[PDB]
Amino acid sequence: MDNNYHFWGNGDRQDVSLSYEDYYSILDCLLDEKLSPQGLMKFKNLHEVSMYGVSYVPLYCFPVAYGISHMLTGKVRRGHSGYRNLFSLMSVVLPFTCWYAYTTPIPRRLYTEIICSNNADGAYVRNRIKQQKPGIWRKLSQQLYNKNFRFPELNQDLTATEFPLDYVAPHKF
Amino acid sequence: GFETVVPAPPTRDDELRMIKATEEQFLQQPRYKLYMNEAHRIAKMNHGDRHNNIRAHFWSNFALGLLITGPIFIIPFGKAFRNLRSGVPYYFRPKYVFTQKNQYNQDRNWGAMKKQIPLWLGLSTAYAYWFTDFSINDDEWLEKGKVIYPHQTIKVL
Amino acid sequence: LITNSYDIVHSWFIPGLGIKLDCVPGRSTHHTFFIDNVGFYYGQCAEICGRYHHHMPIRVCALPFEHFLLWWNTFGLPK
Amino acid sequence: MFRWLFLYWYNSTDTPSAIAKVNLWSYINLRLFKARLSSSIAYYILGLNNLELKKLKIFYKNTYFDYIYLKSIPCLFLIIFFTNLYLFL
Amino acid sequence: MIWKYLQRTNRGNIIQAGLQHRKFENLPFKQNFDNLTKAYDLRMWYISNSPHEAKNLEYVNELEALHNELNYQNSRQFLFRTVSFLLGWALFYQFYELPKTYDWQDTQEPKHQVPAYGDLEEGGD
Amino acid sequence: EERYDALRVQRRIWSMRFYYARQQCLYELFVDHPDLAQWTGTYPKVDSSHGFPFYSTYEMYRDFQSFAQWITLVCGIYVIHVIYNYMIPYYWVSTPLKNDEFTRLRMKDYIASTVLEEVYGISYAEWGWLPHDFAYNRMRGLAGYMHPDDPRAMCTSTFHRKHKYIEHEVEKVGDYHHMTYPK
Amino acid sequence: MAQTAHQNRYQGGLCYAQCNELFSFWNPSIQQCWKGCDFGVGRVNDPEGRIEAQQMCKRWAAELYWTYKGELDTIKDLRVHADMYPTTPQNVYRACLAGVRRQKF
Amino acid sequence: GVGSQDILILSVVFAGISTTISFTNLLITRRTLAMPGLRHRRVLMPFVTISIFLTLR
Amino acid sequence: DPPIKPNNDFDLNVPCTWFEYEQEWWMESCIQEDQFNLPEDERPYNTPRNPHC
Amino acid sequence: LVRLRNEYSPEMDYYLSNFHPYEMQEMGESDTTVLMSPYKYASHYEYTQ
Amino acid sequence: SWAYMYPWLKFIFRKYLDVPYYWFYLNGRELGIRVFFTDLKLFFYGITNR
Amino acid sequence: YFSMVTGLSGAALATMIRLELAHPGSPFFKGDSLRYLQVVTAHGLIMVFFVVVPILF
Amino acid sequence: MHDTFYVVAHFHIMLSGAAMTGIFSGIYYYFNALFGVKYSRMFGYMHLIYYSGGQWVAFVPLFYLGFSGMPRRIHDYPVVFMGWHSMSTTGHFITLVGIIFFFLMMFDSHIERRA
Amino acid sequence: YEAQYACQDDMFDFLMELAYARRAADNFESDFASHELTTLPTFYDTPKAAERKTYTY
Ligand SMILES: [Cu+2]
Ligand SMILES: [Cu+2]
Ligand SMILES: [Mg+2]
Ligand SMILES: [Zn+2]
């Protein structure tokens, strides 16, 4: 498909998907002293990709917010004359569309390398999310198990001798 | 992360060979490439070369994109300005200036161009960014910023 | 000279040396100081500060290093 | 409906004198809308007897996108050729 | 070959579009927004391309009347849609379980809540 | 010759094509958009040689209409130079850095602290320093720029130089009894 | 270049160019490297002149910073890198030696 | 202390308000009520008026 | 009633004929007051004609 | 100085071409106070619904 | 009334402010428009999966 | 006329300033430095903001 | 020269002398427009002479004191300044006399009552 | 001694109060530091830090 599959800020459909809200919350519960210089490099690349992405998301959502605000006013296009109502409805609706976008997980190679890496950095990140962010880890564990990832930190772990630390949502065995 | 054997400080012959290599590598810089003398210069120059390579490809694709976005997208998009949603043919709706659209399809053609040229350029830019390859300059771990010295590039005697 | 002020801005102003250092609270301003002659210079405060802005005098004596060392060992070292 | 001021002001019968003799000042007869120039350059030279009106019209304004695209193909191919030539040399 | 469908411009892109007769055949028996907009568009296109002034001025008067009627219809649409939007907004936030579990570190500044430089803020040495 | 004449005619043709397209645009702007035409500085472009004044004409707003342009350009260049190396680089580092923090801070400071003028400040020191004052200030400068870790001392003209007019103390440039003292 | 011999770095010649190429543009070690170029002008080609120039570098480093008698004689690695700053007499000595090495003629 | 210094600060606030009123009145007087030939020509006016308008801006 | 500064249309201007010959007069007369003119007794005359004119 | 009179004489109609036609944009009542756009302000008139 | 939401505005654009000059060779990356298009595709994928 | 009155006020403040500085030893305020500083501040403020600015503008 | 009487002399020459002399130039230039009568020459000349002389005599010694290191806002100063300070004060009073003449001419302008 | 040289005694006293407050609790900065996860990558941030430097006589 694309000619830039090597890019770290890129991803395919079956990569680990984290919304921007989840990514920032995950960042809020980590320490740089506990990560190797490679893990810090992964996090810095993710930081630059994500700063550009969070800058751009409202631009992505602007056409949909514009259309919805137009449809709320009516079936009359008063360009340059309905700007006041259009942009009040925009300042209301564009936050809602951006809410839907920012709560939408998006796949990334850096997301799938930070979480699913088998070295000590991956285990540290997984356990830190498991303990400090139980809900984020609930969703993320469901996603990882669905993607044929087998880690001890997953709630859906049939080989464990210890009971899960959260509610195990129904899934196909 | 092991270490290599540190050779003894060079003798006068080795120093002269190093000076010869550095001056020979200095002679190779094109006069139209304005990179100052510094440790990273050669590295920068290498980077620049790769960047320029990418640039060329990009522009080619950009031009190609324009061609491929000519008849496939923008012209069929301009097929939508013939009639309005009510079925009545296109007519001029003036914003502030009541321009006289005396020529044949001045209003329709101008509106179509206003909504087509930005679309043409945007689709061409999307094509260029989608199909060109930045792999040669991409460095995920930033390992290519290491300082290369001119005497290490050239072997003398 | 590391100039600073306890409360408000003052100005260590030496007219004979033609220098003025603004002592500003929270600012540890580093100045270089070179006196190329043996000289006793008076000075004042050149930033408005209150009641005794006028009566805030300065006396700086630049001496050769032998006399400075004699002063330092006799009046500076005993603390 | 007038395009030229010299035709507009030559023999006007809707002047306030006559319209006051009838006293019916319709809105559609505002002088703000009666005359309007052609938006194409029109200057005056000296002909053989009097002033001659010469119109300077340079380019059309009704061009559609297909003309622009067809007139751009050589430029795009030149760009492609130059970029590939730079890559090879 | 290539020039036939790459250089030979289509007929429709050149000539003026004709009236779409399909959209004026089966009209609803209503003076709704669709019919009013169709009438407004018809008269506007006519006055934009007609050398006949009597019909043009008649259509100008009728266009002003249609503008008023379309303003009324749009007022109804605006009222209904915006009232529905506001009520849906209020109901959503009435039923939505607002997350009150956000981090409260921003409100706490321990160096400022209990001044770490106490007794030294006033000049004392 | 003939080729030069052809080149001159072609250049004139290009210039006049641009001029007349621009004039058509300006005439249309004046006729249809009188306020923007006035704002941009466009003259009333309707030929009223027939004696009837134009129905919508305006007074010229010649806001832009030598020394002012030069001094504004100089001040703008100075301001752009200041913002390039003093304002924007201030935001590059705002947190403690794990790797090469001192290197990055040195980079930011160097692109700001060291300026070109300093070198001239000593390269033409004779414009106010007499011979003996120059000798004393030479020893003083060699003392004051003794510290090696100072990028400002680099890119500064040497103090190991004789006064251009006449030199009294120094007989040779590098004949000293102490390395860091000019005598 | 207040401590060097030339008004501008271009009068130094090829040696100053090599010194500039040795360190990054913000590194003040270049000036010390330049002093090496000054010490080995008529000495690099002479077999004992090179030793004399190295001794001059040692004296220069000892004069710029406080140094101990054995300190400059027990340096394990005399190689320099781009980010070597003249914060220590060892770094000053290494930069001066590197400047001496790059003085043709 | 509380007293003359606060008087000065609040009087400077009041002077700012008065200057606001003055420059608004005079700038809008020029920008709106200028005679038909002196709407935009700075040069035509007497130099004191040009100076006053520049200082008001 | 406002005062007026009438603007003149360039196309409707007329060539200056109200003592038009005095616009530069003052300037020239300020330059010729301190100028010494060669008397006709000393000005060379009947010089050879230019070959091409 | 032509002192215009409040009449409909042919003499007054002689000066009919010396006046800009009166702009109707500011006539009537406006349903928009003022445009908040800085680029188009004090030059454009307010739009109407 | 929208005024007290400026910390988000700083949160978005200060990160743009702390990007050094390209030819200082700190990372040698300019990933603005590339990330624009890549994230457009990624958001298509994410919405479709959601 | 208001500016005439305020200019006389500023001239009186300047007279106080010059009478304090006529010779050392504080002949006017007699050792009251704070009153002198108040007089200087008032002189500057009413000469700048309440004499010249009123007159001109 | 920062925060010394050299700055005071600079900006007092400028503000007081130049600005008030220009203001008086405008007052005399617009005297008929402002008051409806023509001004009297005698007290006007006296005002001009005394105001200008007072400005010079009051603000040149301030330059002299600024060169000698006299800070601005001190009400007590070293003994070696008093001389010029006295001269400065003298100049101010000269200025005051000029001010008197100014008002006098206005009074004298309305005894005169000429068109 | 470098910190003492760079700081005045007042600022040094403030920093010593902070140092006491952080040494009583044994607050190493590495216990809280996370900003390296939100910092742009640099050539100096390579995983192989020892091999990034080129050494040359
Ligand atoms: Cu004080
Ligand atoms: Cu004081
Ligand atoms: Mg001060
Ligand atoms: Zn306009």
PDB file of N, CA and C in Angstrom, chain I residues 5-53:
ATOM      1  N   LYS I   5     -12.751  70.697  -0.242  1.00  0.00           N
ATOM      2  CA  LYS I   5     -11.500  70.762  -0.992  1.00  0.00           C
ATOM      3  C   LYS I   5     -11.745  69.996  -2.285  1.00  0.00           C
ATOM      4  N   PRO I   6     -12.016  70.683  -3.394  1.00  0.00           N
ATOM      5  CA  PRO I   6     -12.398  69.977  -4.622  1.00  0.00           C
ATOM      6  C   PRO I   6     -11.212  69.256  -5.245  1.00  0.00           C
ATOM      7  N   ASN I   7     -11.403  67.974  -5.533  1.00  0.00           N
ATOM      8  CA  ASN I   7     -10.428  67.197  -6.279  1.00  0.00           C
ATOM      9  C   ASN I   7     -10.713  67.329  -7.766  1.00  0.00           C
ATOM     10  N   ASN I   8      -9.652  67.464  -8.552  1.00  0.00           N
ATOM     11  CA  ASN I   8      -9.765  67.648  -9.990  1.00  0.00           C
ATOM     12  C   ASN I   8      -9.483  66.332 -10.697  1.00  0.00           C
ATOM     13  N   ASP I   9     -10.358  65.965 -11.625  1.00  0.00           N
ATOM     14  CA  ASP I   9     -10.111  64.801 -12.460  1.00  0.00           C
ATOM     15  C   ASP I   9      -8.951  65.086 -13.403  1.00  0.00           C
ATOM     16  N   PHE I  10      -8.037  64.120 -13.522  1.00  0.00           N
ATOM     17  CA  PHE I  10      -6.876  64.310 -14.385  1.00  0.00           C
ATOM     18  C   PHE I  10      -7.290  64.447 -15.843  1.00  0.00           C
ATOM     19  N   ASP I  11      -8.295  63.679 -16.265  1.00  0.00           N
ATOM     20  CA  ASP I  11      -8.752  63.743 -17.648  1.00  0.00           C
ATOM     21  C   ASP I  11      -9.378  65.090 -17.974  1.00  0.00           C
ATOM     22  N   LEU I  12      -9.917  65.780 -16.973  1.00  0.00           N
ATOM     23  CA  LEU I  12     -10.593  67.052 -17.171  1.00  0.00           C
ATOM     24  C   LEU I  12      -9.727  68.248 -16.800  1.00  0.00           C
ATOM     25  N   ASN I  13      -8.441  68.036 -16.533  1.00  0.00           N
ATOM     26  CA  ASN I  13      -7.538  69.151 -16.302  1.00  0.00           C
ATOM     27  C   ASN I  13      -7.310  69.927 -17.596  1.00  0.00           C
ATOM     28  N   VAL I  14      -6.736  71.114 -17.451  1.00  0.00           N
ATOM     29  CA  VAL I  14      -6.413  71.973 -18.585  1.00  0.00           C
ATOM     30  C   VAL I  14      -4.939  72.342 -18.453  1.00  0.00           C
ATOM     31  N   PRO I  15      -4.206  72.532 -19.550  1.00  0.00           N
ATOM     32  CA  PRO I  15      -2.811  72.966 -19.426  1.00  0.00           C
ATOM     33  C   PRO I  15      -2.704  74.277 -18.663  1.00  0.00           C
ATOM     34  N   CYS I  16      -1.677  74.371 -17.823  1.00  0.00           N
ATOM     35  CA  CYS I  16      -1.507  75.541 -16.972  1.00  0.00           C
ATOM     36  C   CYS I  16      -1.215  76.761 -17.831  1.00  0.00           C
ATOM     37  N   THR I  17      -2.051  77.791 -17.699  1.00  0.00           N
ATOM     38  CA  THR I  17      -1.890  79.024 -18.454  1.00  0.00           C
ATOM     39  C   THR I  17      -2.018  80.258 -17.574  1.00  0.00           C
ATOM     40  N   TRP I  18      -2.149  80.085 -16.260  1.00  0.00           N
ATOM     41  CA  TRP I  18      -2.184  81.214 -15.337  1.00  0.00           C
ATOM     42  C   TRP I  18      -0.753  81.524 -14.924  1.00  0.00           C
ATOM     43  N   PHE I  19      -0.082  82.316 -15.758  1.00  0.00           N
ATOM     44  CA  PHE I  19       1.320  82.669 -15.558  1.00  0.00           C
ATOM     45  C   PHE I  19       2.166  81.413 -15.377  1.00  0.00           C
ATOM     46  N   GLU I  20       1.976  80.461 -16.295  1.00  0.00           N
ATOM     47  CA  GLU I  20       2.660  79.174 -16.208  1.00  0.00           C
ATOM     48  C   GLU I  20       4.171  79.331 -16.214  1.00  0.00           C
ATOM     49  N   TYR I  21       4.674  80.393 -16.831  1.00  0.00           N
ATOM     50  CA  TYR I  21       6.100  80.603 -17.015  1.00  0.00           C
ATOM     51  C   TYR I  21       6.802  81.090 -15.759  1.00  0.00           C
ATOM     52  N   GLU I  22       6.161  81.019 -14.597  1.00  0.00           N
ATOM     53  CA  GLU I  22       6.773  81.478 -13.362  1.00  0.00           C
ATOM     54  C   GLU I  22       6.976  80.374 -12.338  1.00  0.00           C
ATOM     55  N   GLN I  23       6.648  79.124 -12.663  1.00  0.00           N
ATOM     56  CA  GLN I  23       6.713  78.066 -11.660  1.00  0.00           C
ATOM     57  C   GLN I  23       8.143  77.818 -11.192  1.00  0.00           C
ATOM     58  N   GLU I  24       9.101  77.784 -12.116  1.00  0.00           N
ATOM     59  CA  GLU I  24      10.498  77.590 -11.751  1.00  0.00           C
ATOM     60  C   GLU I  24      11.263  78.896 -11.608  1.00  0.00           C
ATOM     61  N   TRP I  25      10.655  80.018 -12.002  1.00  0.00           N
ATOM     62  CA  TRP I  25      11.299  81.326 -12.029  1.00  0.00           C
ATOM     63  C   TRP I  25      12.139  81.586 -10.788  1.00  0.00           C
ATOM     64  N   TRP I  26      11.481  81.597  -9.627  1.00  0.00           N
ATOM     65  CA  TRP I  26      12.160  81.883  -8.369  1.00  0.00           C
ATOM     66  C   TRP I  26      13.398  81.017  -8.213  1.00  0.00           C
ATOM     67  N   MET I  27      13.244  79.704  -8.399  1.00  0.00           N
ATOM     68  CA  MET I  27      14.382  78.804  -8.265  1.00  0.00           C
ATOM     69  C   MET I  27      15.531  79.259  -9.149  1.00  0.00           C
ATOM     70  N   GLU I  28      15.251  79.468 -10.437  1.00  0.00           N
ATOM     71  CA  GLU I  28      16.307  79.880 -11.349  1.00  0.00           C
ATOM     72  C   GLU I  28      16.905  81.205 -10.912  1.00  0.00           C
ATOM     73  N   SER I  29      16.059  82.139 -10.476  1.00  0.00           N
ATOM     74  CA  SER I  29      16.568  83.446 -10.097  1.00  0.00           C
ATOM     75  C   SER I  29      17.353  83.396  -8.798  1.00  0.00           C
ATOM     76  N   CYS I  30      17.183  82.343  -8.000  1.00  0.00           N
ATOM     77  CA  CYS I  30      18.032  82.183  -6.831  1.00  0.00           C
ATOM     78  C   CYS I  30      19.386  81.591  -7.183  1.00  0.00           C
ATOM     79  N   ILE I  31      19.533  81.047  -8.389  1.00  0.00           N
ATOM     80  CA  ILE I  31      20.763  80.390  -8.812  1.00  0.00           C
ATOM     81  C   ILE I  31      21.565  81.347  -9.682  1.00  0.00           C
ATOM     82  N   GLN I  32      20.876  82.254 -10.367  1.00  0.00           N
ATOM     83  CA  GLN I  32      21.538  83.220 -11.231  1.00  0.00           C
ATOM     84  C   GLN I  32      21.943  84.498 -10.513  1.00  0.00           C
ATOM     85  N   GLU I  33      21.523  84.691  -9.261  1.00  0.00           N
ATOM     86  CA  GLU I  33      21.975  85.862  -8.518  1.00  0.00           C
ATOM     87  C   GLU I  33      23.445  85.754  -8.144  1.00  0.00           C
ATOM     88  N   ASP I  34      23.931  84.540  -7.892  1.00  0.00           N
ATOM     89  CA  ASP I  34      25.329  84.308  -7.554  1.00  0.00           C
ATOM     90  C   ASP I  34      26.077  83.623  -8.693  1.00  0.00           C
ATOM     91  N   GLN I  35      25.728  83.956  -9.930  1.00  0.00           N
ATOM     92  CA  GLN I  35      26.360  83.397 -11.114  1.00  0.00           C
ATOM     93  C   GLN I  35      26.955  84.529 -11.935  1.00  0.00           C
ATOM     94  N   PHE I  36      28.197  84.351 -12.375  1.00  0.00           N
ATOM     95  CA  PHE I  36      28.887  85.338 -13.194  1.00  0.00           C
ATOM     96  C   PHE I  36      28.891  84.867 -14.639  1.00  0.00           C
ATOM     97  N   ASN I  37      28.401  85.716 -15.535  1.00  0.00           N
ATOM     98  CA  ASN I  37      28.196  85.346 -16.926  1.00  0.00           C
ATOM     99  C   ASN I  37      29.288  85.937 -17.804  1.00  0.00           C
ATOM    100  N   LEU I  38      29.787  85.127 -18.722  1.00  0.00           N
ATOM    101  CA  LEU I  38      30.864  85.540 -19.609  1.00  0.00           C
ATOM    102  C   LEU I  38      30.363  86.607 -20.573  1.00  0.00           C
ATOM    103  N   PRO I  39      30.996  87.778 -20.635  1.00  0.00           N
ATOM    104  CA  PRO I  39      30.540  88.813 -21.569  1.00  0.00           C
ATOM    105  C   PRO I  39      30.664  88.350 -23.011  1.00  0.00           C
ATOM    106  N   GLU I  40      29.779  88.876 -23.861  1.00  0.00           N
ATOM    107  CA  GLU I  40      29.797  88.506 -25.272  1.00  0.00           C
ATOM    108  C   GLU I  40      31.089  88.920 -25.963  1.00  0.00           C
ATOM    109  N   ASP I  41      31.827  89.878 -25.398  1.00  0.00           N
ATOM    110  CA  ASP I  41      33.131  90.222 -25.951  1.00  0.00           C
ATOM    111  C   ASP I  41      34.126  89.081 -25.795  1.00  0.00           C
ATOM    112  N   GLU I  42      33.941  88.234 -24.783  1.00  0.00           N
ATOM    113  CA  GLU I  42      34.862  87.145 -24.504  1.00  0.00           C
ATOM    114  C   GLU I  42      34.335  85.779 -24.913  1.00  0.00           C
ATOM    115  N   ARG I  43      33.053  85.659 -25.227  1.00  0.00           N
ATOM    116  CA  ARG I  43      32.496  84.374 -25.622  1.00  0.00           C
ATOM    117  C   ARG I  43      32.889  84.069 -27.061  1.00  0.00           C
ATOM    118  N   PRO I  44      33.551  82.944 -27.329  1.00  0.00           N
ATOM    119  CA  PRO I  44      33.921  82.620 -28.711  1.00  0.00           C
ATOM    120  C   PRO I  44      32.693  82.447 -29.591  1.00  0.00           C
ATOM    121  N   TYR I  45      32.831  82.861 -30.848  1.00  0.00           N
ATOM    122  CA  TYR I  45      31.721  82.896 -31.785  1.00  0.00           C
ATOM    123  C   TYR I  45      32.218  82.460 -33.155  1.00  0.00           C
ATOM    124  N   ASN I  46      31.273  82.058 -34.009  1.00  0.00           N
ATOM    125  CA  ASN I  46      31.574  81.580 -35.360  1.00  0.00           C
ATOM    126  C   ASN I  46      32.528  80.390 -35.332  1.00  0.00           C
ATOM    127  N   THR I  47      32.331  79.501 -34.363  1.00  0.00           N
ATOM    128  CA  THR I  47      33.129  78.294 -34.283  1.00  0.00           C
ATOM    129  C   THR I  47      32.755  77.349 -35.423  1.00  0.00           C
ATOM    130  N   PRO I  48      33.659  76.441 -35.800  1.00  0.00           N
ATOM    131  CA  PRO I  48      33.365  75.535 -36.916  1.00  0.00           C
ATOM    132  C   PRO I  48      32.126  74.690 -36.657  1.00  0.00           C
ATOM    133  N   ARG I  49      31.343  74.494 -37.713  1.00  0.00           N
ATOM    134  CA  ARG I  49      30.107  73.735 -37.623  1.00  0.00           C
ATOM    135  C   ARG I  49      30.394  72.260 -37.367  1.00  0.00           C
ATOM    136  N   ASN I  50      29.483  71.611 -36.649  1.00  0.00           N
ATOM    137  CA  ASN I  50      29.588  70.175 -36.452  1.00  0.00           C
ATOM    138  C   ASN I  50      29.425  69.461 -37.792  1.00  0.00           C
ATOM    139  N   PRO I  51      30.271  68.473 -38.089  1.00  0.00           N
ATOM    140  CA  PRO I  51      30.232  67.850 -39.422  1.00  0.00           C
ATOM    141  C   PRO I  51      28.909  67.190 -39.758  1.00  0.00           C
ATOM    142  N   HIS I  52      28.200  66.660 -38.766  1.00  0.00           N
ATOM    143  CA  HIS I  52      27.021  65.842 -39.002  1.00  0.00           C
ATOM    144  C   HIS I  52      25.719  66.555 -38.669  1.00  0.00           C
ATOM    145  N   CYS I  53      25.755  67.861 -38.422  1.00  0.00           N
ATOM    146  CA  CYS I  53      24.562  68.605 -38.047  1.00  0.00           C
ATOM    147  C   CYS I  53      24.444  69.860 -38.897  1.00  0.00           C
TER     148      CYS I  53
END
